[PDB]
Amino acid sequence: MVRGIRGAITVNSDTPTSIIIATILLLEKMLEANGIQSYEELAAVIFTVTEDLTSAFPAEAARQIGMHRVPLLSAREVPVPGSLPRVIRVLALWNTDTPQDRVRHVYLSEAVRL
């Protein structure tokens, strides 16, 4: 009995400091919005980045807030022409009985346009 949680955020530059910070912010905001109390509730978390972001692993930011015992995976997003640049996307798999329409998805900065 699992619910996915989507998140997204943009950065202004392809640097490690920016990607990690944005990811931390998004991750923390995703957890708070849904009232998650422990990392033990997470089956797994998957990240994607657009092709214009290569300097850092988003997964590193999750470990900065102690998600060591949570399984993480990252991949590259489809590079659609004209699509929003420099986006970090998150799919958290959450062990919960929360109804689908009661899950809260989090879109930050310019990623709100998505």
Partner 1 sequence: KAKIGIVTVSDRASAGITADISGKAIILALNLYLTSEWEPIYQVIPDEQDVIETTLIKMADEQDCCLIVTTGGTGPAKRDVTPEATEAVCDRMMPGFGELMRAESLKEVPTAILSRQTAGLRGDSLIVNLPGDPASISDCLLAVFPAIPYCIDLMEGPYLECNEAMIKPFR
49 binds partner 1 per the rule CB under 8 A: no
Nearer CB in complex with partner 1: 58/96: 58
Residue type, 65: I
Comparing CA positions, the residue from 99, 87, 88 lying closest to residue 34 is 99
54 binds partner 1 per the rule CB under 8 A: no
Report DSSP state, residue 93.
Answer: E
Helices (H), the chain: 16-34, 58-64
11 binds partner 1 per the rule CB under 8 A: yes
Tokens standing for 59? 């997964």
**Total number of residues that touch partner 1 (CB under 8 A):** 14
Task: Select the residue interacting with partner 1 from 2, 16, 79, 95 (CB under 8 A).
Answer: 16
Task: Please report how many Cα atoms fall inside a 13 Å half-sphere around the Cα of residue 61, on the Cβ side.
Answer: 23
Q: How far, in Å, CA of 76 to CA of 2, rounded? A: 24
Nearer CB in complex with its own copies: 17/83: 83
Where do contacts with its own copies occur on this chain (CB under 8 A)?
1-6, 39-40, 42-44, 46, 48-49, 53-58, 69-81, 83, 89, 91, 93, 95, 99-101, 103, 105
79 binds partner 1 per the rule CB under 8 A: no
Q: How far, in Å, CA of 81 to CA of 70, rounded? A: 34
Nearer CB in complex with partner 1: 54/64: 64
